[PDB]
Design a protein around this ligand. Structure first.
Ligand code: CL
Ligand code: CL
Ligand code: CL
Ligand code: CL
Ligand code: CL
Length: 106
């Protein structure tokens, strides 16, 4: 691949289900074309994929732990929304009951 910007493969109960990408315009979740399976959330029915927003989908923003938000204050810091998408990408395999591996090499 060649940049920019940011892409994450999205796994649910072990299975690759789609791709969450950020760019200048914003955020893009989309389901794999052969993913018939349990929806990620009621906000993301399989028949409506893809989805696009100028701000981080509420569902994905919701996966960010309280704990990491409260750790800003101290005091006070950016939260940005790219900062949240970055957190999702940095952790990742272990902190969300669903999972995201950053699509690298990129
Ligand atoms: Cl099923
Ligand atoms: Cl189902
Ligand atoms: Cl749109
Ligand atoms: Cl809008
Ligand atoms: Cl949402």
């Amino acid at each position: 691949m060649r940049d920019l910007v940011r892409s994450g493969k999205v796994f649910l109960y072990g299975e690759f289900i789609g791709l969450l990408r950020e760019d200048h315009r914003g955020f893009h979740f989309s389901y794999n074309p052969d993913y018939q399976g349990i929806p990620l959330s009621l906000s993301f029915p399989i028949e409506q994929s893809p989805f696009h927003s100028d701000t981080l989908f509420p569902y994905f923003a919701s996966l960010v732990p309280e704990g990491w938000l409260k750790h800003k204050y101290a005091l006070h810091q950016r939260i940005d929304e790219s900062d949240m998408f970055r957190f999702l990408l940095n952790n990742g395999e272990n902190m969300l009951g669903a999972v995201q591996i950053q699509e690298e090499k990129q």
